[PDB]
Amino acid sequence: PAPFFDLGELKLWSFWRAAIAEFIATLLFLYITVATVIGHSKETVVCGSVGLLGIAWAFGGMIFVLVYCTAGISGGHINPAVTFGLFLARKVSLLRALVYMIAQCLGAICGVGLVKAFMKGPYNQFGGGANSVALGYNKGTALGAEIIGTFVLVYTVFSATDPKRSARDSHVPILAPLPIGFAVFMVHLATIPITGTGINPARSFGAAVIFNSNKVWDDQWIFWVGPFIGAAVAAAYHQYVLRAAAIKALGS
Amino acid sequence: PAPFFDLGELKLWSFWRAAIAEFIATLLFLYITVATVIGHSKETVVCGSVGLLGIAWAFGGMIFVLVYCTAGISGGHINPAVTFGLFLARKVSLLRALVYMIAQCLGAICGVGLVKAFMKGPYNQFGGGANSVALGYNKGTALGAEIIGTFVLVYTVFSATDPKRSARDSHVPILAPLPIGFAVFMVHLATIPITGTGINPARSFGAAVIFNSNKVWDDQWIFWVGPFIGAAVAAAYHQYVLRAAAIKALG
Amino acid sequence: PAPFFDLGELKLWSFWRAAIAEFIATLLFLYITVATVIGHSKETVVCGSVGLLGIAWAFGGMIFVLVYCTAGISGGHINPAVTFGLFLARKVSLLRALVYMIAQCLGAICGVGLVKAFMKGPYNQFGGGANSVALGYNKGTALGAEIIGTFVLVYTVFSATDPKRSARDSHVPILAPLPIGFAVFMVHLATIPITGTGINPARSFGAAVIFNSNKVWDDQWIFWVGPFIGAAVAAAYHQYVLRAAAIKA
Amino acid sequence: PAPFFDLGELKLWSFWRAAIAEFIATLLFLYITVATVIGHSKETVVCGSVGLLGIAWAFGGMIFVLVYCTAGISGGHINPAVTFGLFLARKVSLLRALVYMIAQCLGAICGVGLVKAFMKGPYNQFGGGANSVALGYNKGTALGAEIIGTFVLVYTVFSATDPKRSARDSHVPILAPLPIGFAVFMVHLATIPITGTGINPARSFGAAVIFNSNKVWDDQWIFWVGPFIGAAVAAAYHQYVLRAAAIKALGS
Ligand SMILES: CCCCCCCCO[C@@H]1O[C@H](CO)[C@@H](O)[C@H](O)[C@H]1O
Ligand SMILES: CCCCCCCCO[C@@H]1O[C@H](CO)[C@@H](O)[C@H](O)[C@H]1O
Ligand SMILES: CCCCCCCCO[C@@H]1O[C@H](CO)[C@@H](O)[C@H](O)[C@H]1O
Ligand SMILES: CCCCCCCCO[C@@H]1O[C@H](CO)[C@@H](O)[C@H](O)[C@H]1O
Ligand SMILES: CCCCCCCCO[C@@H]1O[C@H](CO)[C@@H](O)[C@H](O)[C@H]1O
């Protein structure tokens, strides 16, 4: 029976800085990625943007950069679904988890907020970076895609945990950033045409909050439930089926 | 004569988990990559997809990710031709090889099956992620391109083996993931116009089973014979010509 | 209060070689990237160029390559804003900072000059690799984008410092090149549509000097002020808020 | 002062295998990259190929892969200009250099030969992967682009040399492969519009020999002379100006 918090949460100066790092990181994540999306969507020259490929790179490349910078401070989650998966495997206390998830959402809101402020017209005209079910797919397909996508991501996160090194003043495992960055990249390549790719409830929520349309709000549940389920299946797979929690993957 | 199995295969709990890791990995491989292919093919706006470059990245990048995740558990093969090459070099017993190959084929079938379940009309309309000889090329060319493409891959795999570290409870060498993923990305840049790029019999077999068309079944043998030959040539070249089995590469 | 220089700047042989490395690397940075940009802009076959994605790669990949080559010699800055940020965190002395910034600017001018010499017509006709505010955006937006873009870069730079290893005969920290190259790549994907992406006053200045147009000079201050502000905030955030100078990523 | 050969060249089993590794690697380099070029050029559907970006990746990524595989056997040169630069810096003997340059040239010819054998029609119709001076540039510009191009590559090679580890039975330094591959990738982004990008006399020679057109042969001297000069200048810069031969670069 896992306690609500532990002594690492009483190291308040570090715990506060971990929270800030998650907040600022998720802000930057959303700023760079949604600005990339809007910059793409608004372009009038045919084949004169960074393209869907550029967009998939923005999301994957930013998770690489942000986990690189924050792994030693917070554990580098940038993603309620990642925090949720790790909480389920008891690598993160409930109190740390909820503090991280709030930070991530508020940061996502602020980041999309910044994109709207910089490019209000194109932002509103071209869908505000929001996830929703694309034409021709049903909600069940959307949800399945969000589950398997988040699974790929959360399973990569588990395999990328360092069993010996932890974020400052915590037991939160350090994460190897490149493979997690690449997993995000891969999932976007597959999933952009179906939902835009969520796999990150905060990323989806921030976009929904700022864009604020009925259609986007109606689909929003898929981007919470899908990722949380995917994360849960990844935690069970890694912990229970493969028994791989002590394994250190050799990065490349 | 190499024995059928060794004491590592009597470590039943680990060996079962290695098979599962190969099953799940190959399922995820086919799912991400075939969904990317179908997603590209169905897009109605010109230059509005991830393009053939995005497709090549999906195959090379997923191999990087999956070998990264599974090297420590199974050895990270995700590919009967890789398993076969290592079997010929005696790094894998016959029993482990067959179990890995079966696991990989079944995984592939399941991953493509999942793409079809998600997008049935576009899945069948745009060719099902299947390999075949493209218009304008002959069988000999397709076969040669699969041999050499598999050679580049399997030579890289051999170069990437860690001579001191093995998968859990085994002597299956750990593999450096990024050069292998890049090798796959590279071969796809070259071979997509010829065959769609096989270099992986389970990848080609999973798509042939789910798509189930005469043309795809007709060409299927190329995607077994080509990679198996390329793998044997790479094994022979690494082991006998260069004698580089103890060599530890860094990247 | 910081001293103008320290004993490391009296190792003249090394200090001069560090300046040359920053000079040559920034030259190479501008040549490869602006040649890519002009090469893309002049192509006549629609979809026949490396695309805006290729251009974003040229900027990010060159920083990866150049920092890799020079981190052990100069500290691998290639960028007055990176140098400024490090100077503010007192990782570099005022004298080394100025010598680096001057070397960077002159390197950038020489690299852009070389592109022009190789392809004068296309260079002039397609904008000279210069940064300026793109149509439909205002000065505030361009400035904001440059602040936050440079913040991403310089924050990654600080996370990428090695706390135990330094450039030859100095205390300038070695930098891990790939995260920094990737941060440059990422910022381009977002910012190319807004300003072309500056996040580097020497890269912006090199192009302005060689292209020499009214609009480009008029906007030039943004590409000094924006990155210098972004760098200062990244330095304050890393050192004062996160207190992370001892950490190795 | 440098002797023609040293005792490492008397270790014949290893020297032979190093020559073979260079031969086979250069063959693979030319096959993958030229097949990529021809596959791109023949595409009938607009924006339906890997594009110029994909071609640049084929060249840069194959150098990464091949230097990864061969560094521990031959030193991973794959390129007479690289071998030449290292020779000038006395890192490779004259005998080893010439054996390597011949192996590379023979390898390149075979690699391109394989592409033509597989797809003769489109190979011949779309220019055979040959380098030559593009419309609107003069010989001086192409020469200069090749010099600086090869300078970027060879200076990166020198920076990537491991000062303590060498190829099997030799003193030829091991090379860190990813920066060298990325250098190749960067030079292609800039130089494809000017010459196709040579920066490698074997790669240029192999394509000229197999494509075999009068115009291409006319330009071929640029692709020997430009790279050899760039390599020489890179060697002088690294060795004499920066005195960097003992520095170990930490790769990322
Ligand atoms: C393990 C599963 C292997 C399945 C092999 C499928 C082979 C299908 O092969 C095809 O069979 C058809 C008759 O059904 C014929 O139309 C074709 O001649 C033949 O190519
Ligand atoms: C592990 C399972 C291996 C299955 C290999 C599939 C081989 C399919 O091979 C197919 O066989 C057909 C019928 O003989 C031939 O007509 C086709 O030309 C051939 O491609
Ligand atoms: C080497 C130090 C570089 C200093 C950067 C030069 C900043 C250019 O600033 C420019 O000044 C012009 C003339 O005053 C103004 O008209 C322009 O608006 C402004 O962009
Ligand atoms: C190992 C195979 C080497 C082939 C010889 C290439 C030597 C370069 O010689 C070339 O020969 C061509 C033949 O018509 C002439 O047109 C060119 O002018 C000449 O440069
Ligand atoms: C055997 C490999 C080294 C030889 C390098 C081949 C360079 C060919 O060089 C070519 O020679 C022709 C005739 O000699 C000239 O007319 C061309 O201008 C020149 O490009």
Ligand SMILES: CCCCCCCCO[C@@H]1O[C@H](CO)[C@@H](O)[C@H](O)[C@H]1O
């Ligand atoms: C286009 C993709 C090229 C990226 C390959 C770079 C090799 C990664 O090398 C290292 O891997 C570590 C493990 O995650 C990271 O912490 C480091 O940032 C990275 O430098």
Ligand SMILES: [Hg+2]
């Ligand atoms: Hg939240």
Ligand SMILES: [Hg+2]
């Ligand atoms: Hg907020």
Ligand SMILES: [Hg+2]
């Ligand atoms: Hg905001």
Ligand SMILES: [Hg+2]
């Ligand atoms: Hg994974």
Ligand SMILES: [Hg+2]
């Ligand atoms: Hg099988």
Ligand SMILES: [Hg+2]
């Ligand atoms: Hg199955």
Ligand SMILES: [Hg+2]
């Ligand atoms: Hg399934």
Ligand SMILES: [Hg+2]
């Ligand atoms: Hg290889």
Ligand SMILES: [Hg+2]
């Ligand atoms: Hg300056």
Ligand SMILES: [Hg+2]
């Ligand atoms: Hg200059």
Ligand SMILES: [Hg+2]
């Ligand atoms: Hg110049």
Ligand SMILES: [Hg+2]
């Ligand atoms: Hg960062």
Ligand SMILES: [Hg+2]
């Ligand atoms: Hg030669």
Ligand SMILES: [Hg+2]
């Ligand atoms: Hg040959």
Ligand SMILES: [Hg+2]
């Ligand atoms: Hg041949």
